[PDB]
Amino acid sequence: GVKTEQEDVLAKELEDVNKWGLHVFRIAELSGNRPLTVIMHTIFQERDLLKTFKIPVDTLITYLMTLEDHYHADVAYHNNIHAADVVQSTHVLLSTPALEAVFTDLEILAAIFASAIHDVDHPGVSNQFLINTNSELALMYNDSSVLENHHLAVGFKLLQEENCDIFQNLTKKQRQSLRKMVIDIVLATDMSKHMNLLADLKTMVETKKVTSSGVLLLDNYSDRIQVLQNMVHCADLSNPTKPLQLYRQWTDRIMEEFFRQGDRERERGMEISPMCDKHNASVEKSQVGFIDYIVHPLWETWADLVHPDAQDILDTLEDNREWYQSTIP
Amino acid sequence: DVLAKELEDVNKWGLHVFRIAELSGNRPLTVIMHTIFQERDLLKTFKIPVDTLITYLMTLEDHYHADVAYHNNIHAADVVQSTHVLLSTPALEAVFTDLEILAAIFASAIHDVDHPGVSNQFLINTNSELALMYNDSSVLENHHLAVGFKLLQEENCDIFQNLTKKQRQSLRKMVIDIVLATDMSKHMNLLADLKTMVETKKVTSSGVLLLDNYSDRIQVLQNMVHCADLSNPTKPLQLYRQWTDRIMEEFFRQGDRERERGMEISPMCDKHNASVEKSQVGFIDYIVHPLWETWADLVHPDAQDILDTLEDNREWYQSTIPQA
Ligand SMILES: O[C@@H](CN1CCOCC1)Cn1nccc1-c1ccc(OC(F)F)c(OC2CCCC2)c1
Ligand SMILES: O[C@H](CN1CCOCC1)Cn1ccc(-c2ccc(OC(F)F)c(OC3CCCC3)c2)n1
Ligand SMILES: [Mg+2]
Ligand SMILES: [Mg+2]
Numbered sequence A: 001g002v003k004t005e006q007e008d009v010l011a012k013e014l015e016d017v018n019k020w021g022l023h024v025f026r027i028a029e030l031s032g033n034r035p036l037t038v039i040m041h042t043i044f045q046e047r048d049l050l051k052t053f054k055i056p057v058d059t060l061i062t063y064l065m066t067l068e069d070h071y072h073a074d075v076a077y078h079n080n081i082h083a084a085d086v087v088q089s090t091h092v093l094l095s096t097p098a099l100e101a102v103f104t105d106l107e108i109l110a111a112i113f114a115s116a117i118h119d120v121d122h123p124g125v126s127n128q129f130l131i132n133t134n135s136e137l138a139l140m141y142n143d144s145s146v147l148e149n150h151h152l153a154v155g156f157k158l159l160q161e162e163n164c165d166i167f168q169n170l171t172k173k174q175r176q177s178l179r180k181m182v183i184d185i186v187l188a189t190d191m192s193k194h195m196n197l198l199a200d201l202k203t204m205v206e207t208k209k210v211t212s213s214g215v216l217l218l219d220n221y222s223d224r225i226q227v228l229q230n231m232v233h234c235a236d237l238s239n240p241t242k243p244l245q246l247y248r249q250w251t252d253r254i255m256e257e258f259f260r261q262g263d264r265e266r267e268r269g270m271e272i273s274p275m276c277d278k279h280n281a282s283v284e285k286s287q288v289g290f291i292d293y294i295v296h297p298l299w300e301t302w303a304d305l306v307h308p309d310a311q312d313i314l315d316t317l318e319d320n321r322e323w324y325q326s327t328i329p
Numbered sequence B: 001d002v003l004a005k006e007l008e009d010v011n012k013w014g015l016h017v018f019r020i021a022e023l024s025g026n027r028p029l030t031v032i033m034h035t036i037f038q039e040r041d042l043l044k045t046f047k048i049p050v051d052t053l054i055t056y057l058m059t060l061e062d063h064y065h066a067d068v069a070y071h072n073n074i075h076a077a078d079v080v081q082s083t084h085v086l087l088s089t090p091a092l093e094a095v096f097t098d099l100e101i102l103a104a105i106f107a108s109a110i111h112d113v114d115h116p117g118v119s120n121q122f123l124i125n126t127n128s129e130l131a132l133m134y135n136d137s138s139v140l141e142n143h144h145l146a147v148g149f150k151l152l153q154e155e156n157c158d159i160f161q162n163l164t165k166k167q168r169q170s171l172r173k174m175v176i177d178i179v180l181a182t183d184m185s186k187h188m189n190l191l192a193d194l195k196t197m198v199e200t201k202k203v204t205s206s207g208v209l210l211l212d213n214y215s216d217r218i219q220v221l222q223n224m225v226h227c228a229d230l231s232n233p234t235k236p237l238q239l240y241r242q243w244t245d246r247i248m249e250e251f252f253r254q255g256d257r258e259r260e261r262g263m264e265i266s267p268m269c270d271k272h273n274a275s276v277e278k279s280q281v282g283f284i285d286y287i288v289h290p291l292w293e294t295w296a297d298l299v300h301p302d303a304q305d306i307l308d309t310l311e312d313n314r315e316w317y318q319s320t321i322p323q324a
């Protein structure tokens, strides 16, 4: 029913699929480590996407399970739980009142699909590490958005596996449009594009047009894709805006992943990357810095775009900043 | 022998590269690159073992396809030699470092390696594995770079083995920036920016250009190699005509694949409904002349003879087209 199994209670947790702060770790446990499959299936059913795009349910489940299997179980942060989280967070953002009836079903499908594949086959090390170690991936992609190009290629390639083509009943034009949107969205998740992306989002907020009900008026592909890019980027950077217990766990996981990268750097006699040295870390201080320099500036701007829809998310972010500030040794 | 006599023209625009291809046993890229590396003393400067250089060049040349009419090793050798001439333009004297020179020449050599003889748009439209790998974005150019660099890993092929770490990093960045700029979809943006650079250009007393940051330097190198890539119509008519025969052969083969697949045949790819003369005049009027006149402005008067030949060849190609 939920598309995996077994001994439920899962249904009661999934009632929060439309809420910020769904307990995605609980969902992962209750689903036998299939949070991405369970959450995607739930969202596709809720949004009636199977009917709209004539997606056979068995094809959807087969693709989701295959996709989920290509997130690495031994990567602490960039795994299937993170993918599930970003999907579900995008799903909530898409339903914000300021965006009512703004996006087509194909644009919604693109944002959700992009979210699901956006980190697939992540090795648990950064683009810069891949470049510095002369990896085959960095060679393939000429040092540019190395991971993000790879996530796209894998996510699309998996559609070709037996009974995995969830887009089989889209028209040729729809497939082309969705492909372009998905590429545009996932490439925008490269953190090196953050400053430019934000600057442009600020420009959009300055010139925003809304109806009397505060619904955004987007004029063209440029407007629509920019909103979707920033939406998924916000979802990717949403951990510090979540209920504190979720945020605390995400922080533990990213630090575990960073520290493992630092261990690889130390073993190779390389300079250890910022925040990756387990011997000299300031986890709490670094979270406060992350919020002050990256996450708050982004979310404050999103909050402006959709005002006042994101006020509670912003309030939670500010409370969570204080938690980490208060726990600096 | 005769080859040595022909290679005496290596510093001149209009080198007979087809003759060099014949005389060298179809090794124009290897012989021209070797000649240029000796001429510019690059082996000494960068401590490149001659055996390593030849090994790499032969394997690189092997990775251009013999069965592709235009985008083959002869084209690569032509772009290398043309870049070599442009680098020596008086307006640019003593402007570029040896590493920058090495980057531009290397970029030229690898810039179309493993080209399949079909366009990016064809690869995108046919859902090719290459377009899947590269997310429909500069598909060929990303691939040319990956292959060109990958070949440095073959036995005794690392020509950059004695560069410092920082030199290797810098060369890699520049080569990527240059080859990506050969994607024709970037042409109008490159040109718009080149025009603005020309408008605000700075020169020394001796009239050499002042390029005081990476952005300006790489911009000039990008446009230089792009001009070399688009230099066929600026060459002596006998050479230009041969290049035109080759590109049309390649285009028509793509059009044949499109027709077989039931696709709309791309512009200039239908052997049954194409005018070679009309298409060349269009290529010159809308792409090649606007680019070369801007290059000519940048380095005035260095490129006046090149621009003259281009204008002559345009007048020649339009001569048999009836007009009011
Ligand atoms: O495909 C070309 C772009 N179009 C756009 C609009 O004007 C017509 C050309 C550029 N390109 N890209 C790869 C190879 C070449 C290219 C290189 C030498 C060419 O001609 C001659 F010099 F040999 C050449 O000729 C074109 C083909 C028919 C008309 C002129 C093309
Ligand atoms: O993985 C790349 C590559 N980086 C490049 C530079 O050095 C290390 C590797 C970046 N990245 C992707 C996702 C996150 C991230 C998600 C949640 C985070 O915190 C908490 F919300 F969970 C988080 O916190 C970090 C510690 C404070 C600043 C970053 C980071 N980072
Ligand atoms: Mg990512
Ligand atoms: Mg069907």
Ligand SMILES: [Mg+2]
Pocket: A217, A218, A219, A220, A223
């Ligand atoms: Mg607008």
Ligand SMILES: [Mg+2]
Pocket: B111, B112, B140, B182, B183
């Ligand atoms: Mg090319």
Ligand SMILES: [Mg+2]
Pocket: B285, B289, B290
């Ligand atoms: Mg003109």
Ligand SMILES: [Zn+2]
Pocket: A082, A086, A118, A119, A236
């Ligand atoms: Zn992510």
Ligand SMILES: [Zn+2]
Pocket: B075, B079, B111, B112, B229
């Ligand atoms: Zn070329």
